């Protein structure tokens with residue numbers, strides 16, 4: 164029974180190979196007692212609940228591990244609190260970013276074998292996992308999550324590292340931006356549940372405009388785009404153009420005072436860094452992945468932006484599976500379930516002789 | 528991979544066809560070749576004998592309109608793995624029901640046929 168762990172910038176997704184969905188999804192947050200031994204750690208929602216008396220760390224805010232004691236706490240919580248397994252009994256598949264530093268892959272491997280005593284483990288690139296989950300071996304993955312977005316071109320099963328672009332905003336930025344534009348509209352979010360309220364407004368009411376200026380006009384001229392939202396305390400507020408302006412920052416990072424290219428352009432640019440002969444296949448298999456690609460309208464608008472950018476006879480297909488919040492996780496579950504996968508794992512035995520660098524020869 | 532079927536694959540000129548059944552690669556009876564369950568995904572290897580003595584490989588993964596996510600995902604993956612196994616020598620093709628390349632359709636002398644149903648998801 165293999166386990167599948169997707170270490171997300173914001174959210175950790177964890178589960179059992181063979182299941183169609185993660186059994187556990189929790190925030191990648193570690194909480195430590197501000198003032199020690201006057202009255203230890205907490206992970207996930209419990210750390211959030213108790214944040215008033217905790218110092219909270221985010222050990223992977225941009226997809227890469229910045230703190231190994233806190234990452235270890237996250238894994239301990241994943242194993243013991245969330246999945247309730249003994250880790251020494253399960254092969255474990257873990258995901259990483261495409262450009263995960265070489266020392267990080269080795270550290271992750273070391274921790275699994277030495278700290279959690281896993282009998283087997285494997286590290287997989289997230290974008291390749293989403294591609295697989297979509298039933299493809301070639302395509303470009305546009306993954307936008309919580310603290311990190313990337314475009315990863317993949318040809319016949321393997322990412323093209325030289326063509327990977329790290330797009331500069333994600334979910335957090337969009338939540339921050341939804342808060343600011345709601346404040347400006349007249350509203351005030353002052354409780355400790357402010358982030359959460361605005362995140363939820365983002366998740367339930369935001370959409371991506373097919374033609375943004377025409378939407379701005381429709382909205383300035385009528386009331387047919389507006390939506391009511393009921394706050395925790397029963398107060399009802401109205402969400403107008405904020406619904407589409409917020410995710411628009413994905414296409415116009417300038418809204419956030421950012422010089423960076425938007426998601427359609429980052430996508431283009433990646434395709435352009437690839438052998439000319441494979442680009443047609445990239446354009447015809449643009450796969451959307453991650454929470455921040457969940458906005459309604461996002462596929463149409465990507466189709467539109469990339470049509471505009473590519474020669475007019477280019478066949479553009481955008482693939483936005485409804486389950487794309489978990490595409491990475493689901494790719495991992497399918498991979499780790501395959502009859503041919505027992506040969507792929509780094510075993511304990513292999514670890515004990517090669518040590519942690521075995522990862523660069525086993526996992527790519 | 529020590530999968531018995533990888534050991535059988537690309538050994539001589541020919542067509543081989545496997546069905547994804549529950550995260551496994553299961554060979555299709557040669558008498559049923561060309562009859563595709565639209566609720567299934569399959570891996571097809573076409574080995575052609577070249578003038579040099581070496582064999583050419585084209586690997587097609589065929590996706591039924593109703594195959595489950597685990598089956599289409601496994602077909603794509605098995606394809607990558609079989610290609611790695613054949614020293615990267617296979618050209619990989621994604622074949623979708625109703626949109627198969629002429630090359631793929633060409634493999635089937637009495638024309639390929641669709642039939643409803645298949646093996647259940649492995650999830």
Ligand SMILES: Nc1ncnc2c1ncn2[C@@H]1O[C@H](COP(=O)(O)OP(=O)(O)O)[C@@H](O)[C@H]1O
Pocket residue numbers: 170171172173174175307308309310311333334335362365366367452453454455456457458488
């Ligand atoms: N329906 C939705 N619409 C817009 N954003 C969403 C939706 N559901 C989740 N999100 C956002 O997705 C981000 C997390 O997605 P995820 O892919 O789990 O990130 P990561 O893997 O980087 O941790 C969060 O910012 C969350 O607010």
Ligand SMILES: [Ca+2]
Pocket residue numbers: 566567568593594595598644645646647648
């Ligand atoms: Ca089936």
Ligand SMILES: [Ca+2]
Pocket residue numbers: 319610615616617618619
């Ligand atoms: Ca190949």
Ligand SMILES: [Mg+2]
Pocket residue numbers: 170171172289308309453491
């Ligand atoms: Mg992610």
